[PDB]
Amino acid sequence: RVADTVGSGPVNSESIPALTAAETGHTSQVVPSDTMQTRHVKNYHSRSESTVENFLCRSACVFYTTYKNHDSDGDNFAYWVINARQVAQLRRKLEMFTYARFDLELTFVITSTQEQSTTQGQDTPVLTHQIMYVPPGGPVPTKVNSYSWQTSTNPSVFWTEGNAPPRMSIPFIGIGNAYSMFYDGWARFDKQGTYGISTLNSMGTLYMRHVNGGGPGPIVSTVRIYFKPKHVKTWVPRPPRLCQYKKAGNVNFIPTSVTEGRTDITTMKTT
Amino acid sequence: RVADTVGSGPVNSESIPALTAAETGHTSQVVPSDTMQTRHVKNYHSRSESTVENFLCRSACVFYTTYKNHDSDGDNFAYWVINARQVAQLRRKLEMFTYARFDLELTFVITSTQEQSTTQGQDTPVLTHQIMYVPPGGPVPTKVNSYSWQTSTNPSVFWTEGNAPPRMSIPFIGIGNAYSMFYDGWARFDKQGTYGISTLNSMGTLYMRHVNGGGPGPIVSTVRIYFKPKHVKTWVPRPPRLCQYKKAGNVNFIPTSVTEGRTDITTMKTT
Amino acid sequence: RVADTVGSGPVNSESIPALTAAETGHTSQVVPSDTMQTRHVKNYHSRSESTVENFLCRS
Amino acid sequence: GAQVSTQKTGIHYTNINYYKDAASNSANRQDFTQDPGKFTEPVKDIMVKSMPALN
Amino acid sequence: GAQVSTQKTGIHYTNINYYKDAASNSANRQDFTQDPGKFTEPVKDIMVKSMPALN
Amino acid sequence: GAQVSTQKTGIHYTNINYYKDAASNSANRQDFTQDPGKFTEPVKDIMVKSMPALN
Amino acid sequence: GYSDRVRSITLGNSTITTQECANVVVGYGVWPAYLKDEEATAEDQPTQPDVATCRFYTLESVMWQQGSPGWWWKFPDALSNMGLFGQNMQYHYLGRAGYTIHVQCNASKFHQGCLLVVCVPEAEMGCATLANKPDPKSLSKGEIASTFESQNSTGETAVQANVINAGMGVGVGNLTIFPHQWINLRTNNSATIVMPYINSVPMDNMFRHNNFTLMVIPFAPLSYSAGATTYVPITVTVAPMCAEYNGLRLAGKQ
Amino acid sequence: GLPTLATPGSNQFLTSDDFQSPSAMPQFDVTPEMDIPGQVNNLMEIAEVDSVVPVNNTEGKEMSIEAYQIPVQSNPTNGSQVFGFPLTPGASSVLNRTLLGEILNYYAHWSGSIKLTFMFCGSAMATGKFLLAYSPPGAGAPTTRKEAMLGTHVIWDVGLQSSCVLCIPWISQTHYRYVVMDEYTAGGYITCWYQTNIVVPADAQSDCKILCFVSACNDFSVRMLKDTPFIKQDNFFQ
Amino acid sequence: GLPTLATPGSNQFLTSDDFQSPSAMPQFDVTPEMDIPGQVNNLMEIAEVDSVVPVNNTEG
Amino acid sequence: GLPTLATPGSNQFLTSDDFQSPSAMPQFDVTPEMDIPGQVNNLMEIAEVDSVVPVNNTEG
Ligand SMILES: CCCCCCCCCCCCC/C=C/[C@@H](O)C(CO)NC(=O)CCCCCCC
Ligand SMILES: CCCCCCCCCCCCC/C=C/[C@@H](O)C(CO)NC(=O)CCCCCCC
Q: What number does CATH give the domain G1-254?
C-alpha cells in the first residue's frame, strides 16, 4: 500500500524543503505537503501489481521450432539450446536487473499443420510428441531414432495432440548464488576469445520429435516454449534497453537517439 | 546434507595424517583440514539427488514392438518377454548394484501410423488397444482372437488412443529376498547348459493387439514399455559397465581400453 | 498369514503321528515337526492372494 | 466422515464411500477369515495325532 | 494440513501444496516488502528536508 | 487421515494414499540414510589418522 | 610388545601367523554368522559341522612371474575337494558359509611388485566368443587357479581373460569396490579378508552357484636384479566360517 | 459432481513425475526382506571409495594394465616432472573413467574436495622424496618444480608409509562446477615432481612404479541427473 | 472449479483395478443372507483337502 | 471414483494463470542463497529514483 496525504497549512521559516543538492546522489524525500498547501487524503492505493514477482510472473514465448513427420536419413527432429535472449520481449524485462534468482514454469504449446501433396486415402491417427531435455555433457541424439531417446535419466515429456499443453517446474539450477544477466568478463584467464554473457550461458539442449509418423502424408509440427519465472529475487536495477537488440549472444547495438524530437523546447504538442 | 569445513591453523607434530597404508584396503578419512590451513566454512550442500532412490526413480524405455490392424491368419499381434537387458541405458544403471529390490511403475506409450495404399473412402474410428500380461505357465495367445484374450485372471489394460498413457504398479514379485542382477552360476546341477543371469530370468510375457481393426486401410501401431523403479533397495556396488553390450542374455563383451589416450603422461590438453 | 515351523528334536514313543485311517474322511493335521527333525522357522508368508474375494475379483 | 485402514506391506490409506448403495463400494480385500476344519477333520470324533484312528 | 490466506480485495482462500519440491508451488504474490532507502538517500549522512545540503 | 511432510527447500505438503497396496504409493524421496564405513575403513582394526598404518 | 603387522588366527586344527600385514578387511563390515530362524525358509534342521569343516584349507600354489597377468579362483567350488567341507557339500542340496581368505606371498627387501587381492561376489564372466557361453572348465578348475591374459583370449568356449576387463567387461582398476587388500612386496607379506555369506537367498546349492571369485592381479609387475631368488610363489589359504547345510540325500551333482 | 477445472500438464507423461497409480496385482504378498550385506543408500558412498587412476594412459598403454603404472626412476637431474593432469574429474581422459568419474558422468554439476593417494611400489631398499602439488587455475600450468611449489602441496618422503595422501581442497569462484569441460568452470592443475631423485643400492632396481587412487571427501556432492555419454546402443540386444 | 491435474493412467481400463462405481439399480433391496453350510473363505482351505493321485497314469 | 464435473476453462492455457505443477527435477538441491547488495522488491523503488530528462530534445 501507498502513503496517504497530510493536511498542510501556510508556512514562514528558514527551513528549505524546496532546495537541496542533487550533486549528493541522494533522491529528495519531498512530498507535496512541502512547497504548497494540501488537504488531508487517506490514500488506499496499493503497489501490489508492481512487485518484482508480478512484473515477471507471466508466461512468455522464448522460442520455437519445426520438424517433419517424415524424412529419410532420420534428420526429422529439432533441438534448441536453452537461453532467454533470442526473444525481445522477455529479455528486456529480465535485463532490468543485473542478477536474479527464480524457479521456472515451463509450458509447451505443440501444434501440427499438414502440407500439400498427391497422397490419397489419408485417415491419420492422433499425433504423439516427445520433448527431451539434455543436461550439458549428456549424449545428444543424431537421428529420429538414435538410442538416446530412451531418456533413462534425462527427463522428458510425452504428449498426445488434442490435450492440455504440457507443463513442468524447474528449480533454481544456477551454479552461483544467482543467475547473471550481464557479465563484463571473459571465458579464459587470458582475455582471449569469448567476451560477454555468452560465457555464463550453458544450460543444455531441448530435443523434440514425432513419436509416430501419423500418415504417409507430409506434416510439419511446431513447438513453442514458454518461460514463467516464479518465486523471484532481483538485485541491482539497470536502465531499460534503449537500442534495439541485434544479437542473441551479446550486447551489440547500433547507436540510438535518447527519445524523439519536438519542434521547440516549448512545444506542448509532443512529437 | 554434506559436512562443513573446519578452521585450520599451522601444525608441528609426529602425527602423520598425510601418510597411511593403502595396502590396508581401508579408504582414508583425510579432510583438507589436515595437510593444509583452512578457513571455517558452514557447508549447506545436500546429497539429496544422489540417493539410490533418485538415481533410479525415472521412467526409461526398455523395449517396444509392432503389430498391424490387419492380416489374414490372425498373426497380427505382438508379444515380448519381460526383461531389462535389451536396452543399454537402464541396464547399466541397474547393473551398478549386484542385488536390488524395488516396486515397478509401468507406463505405456501407444501410437499408430498409417501406411500407403489405394484404399479410398477412409473415415477411421478411434483405435482401442489391449496389453495383456501373462504370468509364466499361463496359456499364451495364438491368433489375434484366440480365447485367451478374455483375461479372466490375467490382468491387462484396455486403452483408447488419444488419452493419457496407460500406467500400473507392480510389487516386488521376486522369488528370493531380492532381484539378482548377476548370477555366476548354472541352471542345472551338472553345470550343463545355460550359464548366466539368463537362468534367473523368468517373468512372463506381455501381449499387445488391436481390439478393433479401425478401417480397411493398413495401419501399424507401436507399443513402448517404460519401467520406473520405486521404493528402492540396493546391495553390493559394482564397476560400471566398461565395454559396450553385445548380447541381452549374457555378459559377453569384446575387450575395451580402460580410457582414452593422451600424448604424454604430462599432457594437460586431455585427448 | 501362514503358520511358522516348530523346532523338532529326536523322539521315541508309542505315539503314531505318521499313521492314521484315511477311511475316516478326516484329513491329517500332520506337520513336518512329526516324522522328522526340524529347525525353528518364523514364517511370514500370507495367503492374502488366495482369498475367495481375490480369486474372483478380476474383470 | 472417512476411514483409515492399513495397506498391504511386507502406513495406511484413507477412504470414503461416495455412493448410497453399498453395492457401489470396492471389493473388500483386507479380509482374512479361514476355517479348514469344515473340509478336514469333519468327523464328529476329535482325533489325536499321536494316537491311532482305530483302537 | 492446509492453510488459509486473505484474498486481494478493495474473505480468504484455502490452499494445500500437493508436491514435494517447493519449486512446484505457485508464485507468492501475497508478498509486499519494500526498501527505497537503497536507491534514494544512499548517503552515509542523513539529510533533514528543512535543512540545506551544504552548510 | 492425511500426513504433512516438509518440502525440498534451500513449508510442507499434505498427502494421502488412496490405494490399498503400498506398492501403489509414490517413491519415498524424503529419505536420507548413509553409511560409507561399509565401503571405506572396512578394516577390523580402527585407524587413527594422526598415526601410521604400520607400527 | 606388538606390531599392527603381527597376527595370529586360529580355527580348528589350523593356525595362521602374520609377521607383516596391514589390518584385516572384513566383508562389508559384516562379520559372518549362523542363519537366524527369522531369515530361513528350509524347515529341516541344519547340520553345523563346525571344527570338522570350518578350518584352514590351503590350495595349490602358483608361481608369480614378470609376465603373470593374474589369477582367479571361483569359490563356492574350489573347496569342493577339501576334506569334510567338500563332503557335506556333496551330500547336501543347500548350504551357506562365510570365509577367511588369506593370500600369502613373500620376497626380499630387494624384490618389488604389487598384487591386488579381491573378492568379487557374483563374478559372472563373458565368453571369448560372442555367440557362445564359456564352458565350465574354463570358468573354474577347483583348487587349480585359472589365469587372466595380457591380451585377447581366443575362440570356441574360453573366457575373455584379457586382464584389463577382469573378464567381466569392466575397468580392472575399479575392482576396488569389492572387499580387498594390496600385497606390496615392499611393505607387505600377506593379505587377509573375511567374506561373509553374500547372496539374494538365505542358502544355495554349492555346485550350481559360485557366490564369489577371488582374484589376484598384479598392477606392479614383479622385478629383481640378477642374482636374486627367481622363484616367487603365491599361496592361497581359505577357511569356511559358520557353514550350515540342509536337504540331506545321496551324494553327487545331477 | 464436484466442480473441477483441469490445469495445463494434464494427460501429460513426465519421465520424472511421481504420482500414485493403481496396482495391477492386488493384495500381492511380497517375499520377506532379508539382510544382504553391503547395502548402499546413496551413490556417494561409492565415490568415497578409492579406485586406481590410469595416469599413464599413454601411447597404447590404455589397452594394457600399464595404464595405471606411473614410471619413476633414478635421474641425473633434479626437478624433473613425474606427471600432470587437470582437475577436470568429469571429462578428463585420465579421471572421468574412475569410480568417481563414472558417477560424475551421470550428473552435470559437482562440488567438493578430492583425495589422491599415491603408493610407491619399488623395492624396500629404494628411497626418494616427491613433491605432489595442485595449482589453482589462473596463471598457466606449472612447468618447474618451482611455480608448482608456490601452489598447494605436500612433500612425500617414501619411508615405511608407502602411501601418501595429497588432498585437493575445493576452491572455486562458484559453488558447483560443470561436469563437462567449461573454461568458466576451470579446475586447475595437478602435478608431481622429484624433490630428491630415487636413490638405490647395488643390485636393486632403479626404476619403480607408483599407483594413484582418486576418491571424494566428506564434503563432496553432485546435482542434475543425466544419461552417461559412455554407453551407446544400435538395436535392441539379443 | 477446483484446479485439477490429470495423471497418466486416466480413462484407462485395468482388469484388476478396484474403484467405486455408480449403481445401475438404486436402493435395491437385496434378498437376506442365509446360512448355507460349508462356506469357503480362501482357496487354500481347498488345497488342504486330500484327493487321490493318479500315480499309475501309465500305458492307457 | 469421486464424482467430478469439469467447468469451462479446463485444459486452457492462460498466460497469467498460477497453479502448482510437477517438478521435472525431483529433490534438486538448489545452491544456497547469498546476500547480494541492492535488492529490489517492487518496480516502484525504481521509479522513486531520479533520472535526467531530455527536455531540450529539440532539432537533432
Ligand atoms: C522436461 C523438463 C525440461 C526442463 C528444461 C529446463 C531448462 C532450463 C531453463 C533455464 C532458463 C534460465 C533463464 C535465466 C536467465 C539466464 O539465462 C541468463 C539471462 O540473461 N543468463 C545466464 O545464462 C546466467 C548464468 C547462470 C549459469 C547457470 C548454469 C546452469
Ligand atoms: C497390466 C499389468 C502388467 C504388469 C506386468 C509386470 C511384469 C513384470 C516386470 C518386472 C521387471 C523386473 C526388473 C528387475 C530386474 C531383473 O530383471 C534382473 C536385472 O538384471 N534379473 C533378474 O531377472 C532377477 C531374478 C529374479 C527372479 C524373479 C522371478 C519373478
A: 2.60.120.20
